[PDB]
Amino acid sequence: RFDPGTSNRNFRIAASDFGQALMLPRLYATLEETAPQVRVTGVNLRHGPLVEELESGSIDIAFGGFPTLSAGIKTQTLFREEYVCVMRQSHPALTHGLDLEAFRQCRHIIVTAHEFNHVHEQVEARLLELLPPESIRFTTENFLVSAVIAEETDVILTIPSRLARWFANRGGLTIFPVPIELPSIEVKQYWHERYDKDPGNIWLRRVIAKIGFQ
Amino acid sequence: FDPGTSNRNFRIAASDFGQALMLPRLYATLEETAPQVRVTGVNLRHGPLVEELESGSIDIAFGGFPTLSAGIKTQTLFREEYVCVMRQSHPALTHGLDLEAFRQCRHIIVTAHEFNHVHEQVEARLLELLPPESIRFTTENFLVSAVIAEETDVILTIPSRLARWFANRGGLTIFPVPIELPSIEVKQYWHERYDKDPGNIWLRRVIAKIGFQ
């Protein structure tokens, strides 16, 4: 059914834009070394029921936190992620510290995710509860968009640390801890039972599961 | 409608590139004159944009959408060209990017077909001229693909503003693309139903006043 060295299969992985940008580069080596005509497509999250897409075969694997996925779904946990805060290094509060109430008074960009039933909705909910409505300036579905915007303007962004670190590395942004206690996230890969024994699917899970996510 | 005291959440539909470009150019106007106004960036979807503009679901669309015509007003904001980027630590760098070398590289392609975005044209041209095995990754977000090109040895063909944005802050280097590609017109789009809506009108005018480099 599936041979890495000769396959032309195009694998589709559903993930947030962040999850995509995290995953695919970690697959490149394996692809050039052992599967040089295999393709990986990063598919955005949708409003429709994700379990259906895994069932129909239109998605091979989902990657991230999808608490709503259960029946007929098999999973494996890959790592934990924690949230932090960022603001750009030419931000007025940077010269200052930031306790909880100064935090509440700044401008925020929120990444929204409840429509996609992605675990980040947990954080989103916490922030919408905490923050004065007037404190929220921008809203977007994409983590990477939100990061770029935080670099170009004075808004505070609350995001997975891995993403924060990737953008900190260019010095646009400073990382500081969230002044509230946010849930720790379990990031996994998800697939459907109907494909548990599919050779290609099995191969992909193996590769993903061997990724050094440290 | 008063900007100074409104709390309206305006929804703009654009590619992730379009959102990243637009919203920052709106911050000052918000800070100075509409401090309670929210802007939301919405991803392009499966369905037809017109039905979203009509619905009120989306206030304005930003980008290049040839398909919007019947009941849509537009104002052209600027025009964009395409280039290639590869990271400085790429073998093909110190060698030139002629068409024959191009074909021998691995590519990441941004796909746009689903949401009738002008990039369809660019995507189609590349697929025409590239062997199916030089294509390694595919994604629908420009920003995703730009960080992937920064992390791995893939070639990425993208709009120059996006390119210039990543070249400055990192390892990607910009190359002309040895493939014939259309120029692009970036417009704002809105339904005629809201042509006269004060809120909309205000937004459209703030945008038409942005100085896109």
Numbering used by the authors:
A (entry chain A): 89 to 302
B (entry chain B): 90 to 302
Share the article's original sentences.
The monomeric structure of the PcpR inducer-binding domain contains two nucleotide-binding (or Rossmann fold) motifs connected by a hinge region.
Although 4 molecules were seen in the asymmetric unit, PcpR appears to exist as dimers in solution as illustrated by multi-angle light scattering (MALS) consistent with weak interaction between the two dimers in the crystal lattice. To further analyze the biological relevance of the oligomeric state of PcpR observed in the crystal lattice, the apo-form coordinates were uploaded to the Protein Interfaces, Surfaces, and Assemblies server (PISA). The results of PISA analysis gave average buried surface area of 1985.3 Å2 and ΔG of dimer formation to be −10.1 kcal/mol. Despite the close proximity of the PCP-binding sites in PcpR, there were no significant conformational changes of the backbone, or the dimer orientations upon comparing the apo-form to either the PCP or 2,4,6-TCP complex structures. Comparison of PcpR with BenM and DntR indicates that both our apo-form and inducer bound structures of PcpR are in the closed conformation, which could be due to a crystal packing forces.
